[PDB]
Amino acid sequence: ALNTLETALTTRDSFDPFASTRTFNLAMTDIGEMYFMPPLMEALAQRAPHIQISTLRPGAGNLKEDMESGAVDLALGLLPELQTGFFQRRLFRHRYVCMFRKDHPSAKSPMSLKQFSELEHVGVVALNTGHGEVDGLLERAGIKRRMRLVVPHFIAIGPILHSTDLIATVPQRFAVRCEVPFGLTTSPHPAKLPDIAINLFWHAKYNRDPGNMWLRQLFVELFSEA
Template sequence: MAELRNIDLNLLVVFQHLLQERNISAVARRLDLSQPAVSNALRRLRSALGDELFVRTAQGMQPTPHAERLGGPVGEALALLSHTLDATHDFRPEESRRRFRIAMTDVGEIHFMPRLVKACSRQAPGVRIDSLRLAGTDLRREMDAGHVDLAIGAFDDLGSGFMQRMLFRQGYATLFRRGHPTAHEGMNVKAFRAERHLVVSRAAPHGQVNQSLERAGVKLDEHFSVPHFSAVPYIVSTTDLLATVPRKLADTVAAQFHLGLFAPPIRIPALQTNLYWHRRFHRDSGNQWLRALMVDTFVEEN
């Protein structure tokens, strides 16, 4: 095992970015280095650690098993060091140029991102927010390493080490185009079942929608489907399909796409949306500011 004193900390930063990007040119751009400098850093790391670490393939620079094993601990160590150094200074949103990363779904982006952009423009004009799709072990690993600051949604599988706060609960609404020949508020289950539906096939954590449709007698494999909610209003506005979606999404898109909406005549459990963060960053001033912004902006919608 190489002694820590023989490894330049900057080499580990390059290593961590290579794990994420799998491309030397991309890492060079991200770190504002030349490609030869990144290649040289990789050569020095290979020599210090006695392993190839990354092998060039048609899919990019793929990590060796040893590099994969190092990824988690190195990421956590760098994140802890970074946040420790940041903690010596109070976070000043009006001066900060920090980039936060928030895991959320496509329907979450539609609801949260516009208002977050406006809030940051007022309070922290230099702050930027990246949204990304992660769940399960991938989300836990990225939050463990400090690569993801917050997660918004319903994540029951994060396990210990995470803190959470409820933002709001919501029901569901069925969307239809204005002028639809048969859809209307108050339609019964039989009429609802007889309509053509647009199903969101990858609805997690909204899977209870599809389960409720099936219990009501709607055979999902006989209807049209899309993988995500973001395409729903575009399709419903130009067809006679019905789509049952989270209420906040329905309220957001109905007027813009000239859609009507009604409470579906089937029972669907309410969806709870939570804010999650890692316990290690509970006292990080930047993370605290972002959490407070989320709460101030969205929790009143309960």
Template sequence: MELSDVDLNLLLLFQRLMHERRVSTVAEQMNMSQPGVSNALAKLRRRLGDPLFVRGPGGVVPTPFALSLAEPVSQALAILHDALNPETGFDPLRVTRTITIGMTDIGEVVFLPALVELLSREAPGIALNTVRDTSVNLSNEMAEGRVDLAIGLLPQLKGGFYQRRLFNQRYVCLFRRGHALEGAPLTLAAWREAEHLVVVSAGTGHGQVDDWLKRRGVQRRVRLTVPHFMSVGYILQRTDLIATVPERLALQLAAPYSLSLRALPSTLPAAPIHLLWHARVHHDEGNRWLRGMVIDLFADSSSQTRRTKTAKAEVGR
């Protein structure tokens, strides 16, 4: 099929239907009648040889072929839009906008205080909003422009994204001050015999700790399992449990909750923490400025000298 065979307006309609999943909503947004939307969709179906959308509960549901087209069509339209609407300049002191960043609860503790402090000084008109990748489809939200950046251990963000490594996150052992382990060498036997608080943080990649331990047959006495890191400080402060957590989180929790951290008796693989952004905002001046601020604040010295590592912007990588 040649590009001349497809009307650009049909691709715009396709993108709106992918996002809204309701013909009536798309008709209103595009100032069309519902029969007009249906006729345009029928034309695109004939061109592409696929139903694209079928009726479902409360609207329409995309076919597998439509899902495979969604990201490349979105990228192509975004590139065309950016080319036709170039930015005339970005002044952080004058701009007023809300930036949305995808991050975990760990990220909110580690990154937000310093980032908010910097923005209040360098870009007072920028407000921050955060979302969890477990509560939204982060890949789609970034592709469609509702999330500007993501920070963390996010292996699910692949094709269509750029990434910059900020640092490698080590894991440490964290427990309350005065714990029996505080005054003695932390041996593997002592670590295994202690009662553990384990965090199962779905979708963040930090589950690699448990996977690594299981592959090597390392057993530990799990007393409590929780789904997020926000309660770790409170729990450790009042119990004899210990937890294996990312080092930068441990450093933030140690003083407020009277906790001690120790190197683990067995070295776990470090977790690569990345700054990620979608190809659609790669050339956006505001996004580029914010990326630079995040890199200046959080990238370690080796990452500062390393060239940006880029993921190929193609589906399925």
């Protein structure tokens, strides 16, 4: 409360996007990095050519603490622990989808729940993320899956689906970075999987820092569906 009256009465560091050499530190998941970073860096080349960006996974250590000190400027995803002293803004919802190689010998779009349960799958654990909940969701619905392979993260999924008959359950924004590169198609998901809201977060201490505001607005401009 009383650090909002001190941190508003302070003079603000100027921000000129053509001249800034500031480094902005951003927390995001592996899917975030793959979704956000290509179009963000494309935009920054034309708009703020001398700033630097570095990212990190929230799943390291004390994101909250590091956001309060200014060590991390912004965070993206579903980050339930960030509540008191944090603003937030919803960018979009992840819709889950089934993915497999273009010329899979039996897989169809749209895919019935029956065929989903007949086929063999790769799964991704994605510990402590929204996507980490997909496994429990399907199990609790009594939807049987032959789990031929399980991996902890998303990196190998495109190449694995390319060169096997496995199928995967995947956020649709992941699918879009993979369909063409890896010769893959998608189907609407046959199960009842709920969406995952992806939010942009920042600490209150930087609510009026012009650099921080400038970067947030660019995220909203490029990524907001809302």
